Structures are given as structure tokens and as C-alpha cells.
Design a protein around this ligand. Structure first.
Ligand SMILES: [Ca+2]
Ligand SMILES: [Ca+2]
Ligand SMILES: [Mg+2]
Ligand SMILES: [Mg+2]
Ligand SMILES: [Mg+2]
Ligand SMILES: [Mg+2]
Lengths: 221, 221
């Protein structure tokens, strides 16, 4: 499996409040977080706490990935809520998170998210959005109806997806998808080398205006 | 520093729902949990989740021990609440926990608890109860007003205590203190060898009736 990850502040925002992590050692899990300097702290806490929770508990709990991912996400949630106290006027910081946890065999991806960061799967020039955005509109802009850093955290969406060789998975913040249509994203995911695809996605988000922080993780199965 | 820990089912109860852990490698933290086979699972989850949270985050967070201990305890709380779902009719399991986290220097003890398990400090033949039991009566039997395994977890008491050479710390479940008065506990803590003191405390709890599971951790500073 090949994986590439890239974050970019984009062409308009002053700071990058997105964060990501790839388990480069074992390629088991992948995390993107879009914060809202409260946002930087929230996305960093989410990525670090989800990463550490998964590192610590993966051996013990990979047989129950939904419990593992819920507890990782709640560990992150609590950590953000504790920093909200004092802590100060970072009162309201929050972050999205999207996580892929691969099973040991590597052909099942547990997709977990809170917010409007996305997971997509690409296959043979067709792209599918896997996560459903936690926005009031997607519910049927708002924007967010759910984020990490709330005592009122009400939903952690988790679903498995089975994978085939040659599939790609994309974790992205909305800085990608507010600039690039899915049709455009799909073309860049067709680039064989995932490092080039990741860079091309970011570069295209910027070519198209880059109005937000943009983060991608591209995984080729 | 010398530490000894012992748990015993006692002379009446059928199973031991107490649990404990000593960081024998680095002597940084010590945990006793009294569960209420839901109780066994709750105390095991609390000890393991507090232990793992502290192992993972101690380097990063020992400079903010109250945040570290609150997040360790909430990690445990959440893990118990997730097993309550399904999980099944273990619906109501809960556990006390008492934790000592020593600072690096080893002469300050952060005492954290939920329930009616206790931390005591002994010095020069005098004993002091440090934690205040979360029972309705102590509030002014009930018994518990607080335990881990509640969505409604409302209190995690945490306080530091400074230590002198020759002090002893005792973590115990109420199986000790419902059989032995503090005057009696104090005498056994005067035993120089902490392994002998721990064994003597348990043995005395049983001599006096042993009506409950009894767990002690004895630390000589
Ligand atoms: Ca943002
Ligand atoms: Ca019990
Ligand atoms: Mg958005
Ligand atoms: Mg964004
Ligand atoms: Mg009691
Ligand atoms: Mg008891």
C-alpha cells in the first residue's frame, strides 16, 4: 500500500488549522482534522489523542474497531473540552476529524468521522463520497452540526468499507471539496503515483482559488 | 521507595471484584478499584484504562497532573459506559477508583478518586484519611453517590499531598476500612517492611471478619 499526505494553508487563510497523521510505520490508521488560535489547538489535540489512543489500544481492541474508534474520538473530545476549561476563551474551539482504520489484512477500512471533512473511495475512475457531512444543510450553509470539542457530542459516524486492489481512499478537509468538484478530484486520484496525486489535488485546490486550508491523505490499496 | 500490593477476596464474598495495579517499573502510579459479573469487569476496565492512559500520556502531561488524571479517569469512565452498551444487563456496572500519581521527584502524591475506596497517609504513628468518601452519608449507609461507569459522572476528586521520608501511603478498598478502624490500620502501617505490612493489613481485615473483598497498596516513601 502507498500513502501520501499533504496539508497546505491555501491561498487566502492566514494560518493552517488543519492537521493530519499517517501511521507510516504500520500503515494502520490515517487522520485528518479541520479545526475552528483555538482551531489549531483543537485539530492538533484531536489528531494526537486519536493517534495515541489507537497506538495504545489497537492490539487490544482491533477486534472491536467501532468501540476502539468511539473511545479514540471521545478521548480527543474530552481532551478538547478540558482545554476549553480554563482555558481561556478557547471556550468554543472545535475540530472535525475523519479517520480511516484499516484492518490487519488491509482490505477493510473503518471510516469514522465528526464534521464535514470527508472520506472518499475511488475505483476505476469513479469516485464515491463515503461519509455524510455533519452540516445542517446536508441534513437538509449552516455549517457544522457536529464537531469534536463539545460536551454535547451526539454523533460519531463509523462504517466499514471493503477494499479492492487498486482502490484509492481519500481523507480530506473541506478545503479540497469547496474548490474541486468530485469529477475533478476523481481525475487526480487516477494519477498512479500517490505522492503525485496528493500534490496535484492540493495544487488544483489552489489553482481553483485555494480559499481554505486544504489537507489530503491519499491511500492506494 | 518500597511498594507492596495485595488483594484478597476475604472470607465471605464469592468473588473478588477489586482490582489493583502498581507501576513496578517506574513506581509512578498506583491504582485500586472496587467494582460493583459486572463489578469485576468494571474494576478491571478502570485499572487497565487508567494505567494505559497514564503510561501513554505521562511523559506529555505529567506537568499537568490534574488534567492527566481527569482524562485517565474519563477514559476509564467511557470505556465502562461503552461496555454497558450493549453489553448486556452489565447495564449498571460501576467501580470505585483511587489513584496515586507521584511526581517525578517522588515526594508529591496526586490523589484522585471516585467512590469510597480510600487513600491514607501515615506518618510517625499517626494516620490521616486523605480522600472523602463519595457516599451519601459522608455527604451527611447509602452507599455510593459517585462511581465510574456513569454517564452522569459528576465528580473526580483530585488533590496533592506532599510527602516526607518515612511516610507511608495506603490505597485501599472499603473491605479494609469496614473491618479495621483507623487506629488498627495505623499500627500495621508501622511495620517497617511494606510487604509484611500489606499482608498484615489484609490478614487483620480477615481476622476481624473479612466480610468484603479487601485490597491494599502500601507505599513507603
Ligand atoms: Ca478550519
Ligand atoms: Ca465491590
Ligand atoms: Mg464546510
Ligand atoms: Mg475548512
Ligand atoms: Mg462502602
Ligand atoms: Mg467493597
Amino acid at each position: 500500500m502507498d500513502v501520501a499526505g499533504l496539508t497546505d494553508c491555501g491561498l487566502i487563510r492566514k494560518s493552517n488549522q488543519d492537521a493530519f497523521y499517517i501511521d507510516e510505520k504500520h500503515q494502520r490508521f490515517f487522520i485528518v482534522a479541520d479545526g475552528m488560535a483555538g482551531g489549531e489547538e483543537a485539530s492538533r489535540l484531536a489528531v494526537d489523542h486519536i493517534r495515541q489512543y489507537l497506538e495504545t489500544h489497537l492490539e487490544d481492541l482491533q477486534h472491536d474497531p467501532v468501540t476502539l474508534l468511539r473511545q479514540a474520538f471521545l478521548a480527543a473530545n474530552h481532551a478538547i473540552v478540558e482545554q476549553q476549561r480554563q482555558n481561556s476563551a478557547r471556550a468554543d474551539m472545535g475540530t472535525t476529524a475523519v479517520v480511516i482504520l484499516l484492518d490487519e489484512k488491509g482490505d477493510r477500512a473503518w471510516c469514522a468521522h465528526v464534521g464535514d471533512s470527508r472520506i472518499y473511495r475511488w475505483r476505476k475512475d469513479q469516485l464515491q463520497q463515503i461519509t455524510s457531512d455533519h452540516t445542517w444543510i446536508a441534513q437538509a450553509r449552516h455549517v457544522l452540526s457536529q464537531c469534536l470539542g463539545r460536551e454535547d457530542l451526539s454523533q460519531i459516524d463509523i462504517q466499514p468499507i471493503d477494499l479492492e486492489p487498486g482502490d484509492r481512499l481519500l481523507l480530506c478537509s473541506d478545503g479540497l471539496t469547496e474548490e474541486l468538484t468530485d469529477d475533478v478530484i476523481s481525475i487526480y486520484l487516477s494519477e498512479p503515483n500517490v505522492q503525485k496525486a496528493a500534490a496535484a489535488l492540493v495544487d488544483a485546490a489552489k489553482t481553483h482559488g485555494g480559499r481554505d486550508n486544504v489537507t489530503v491523505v491519499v491511500i492506494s490499496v
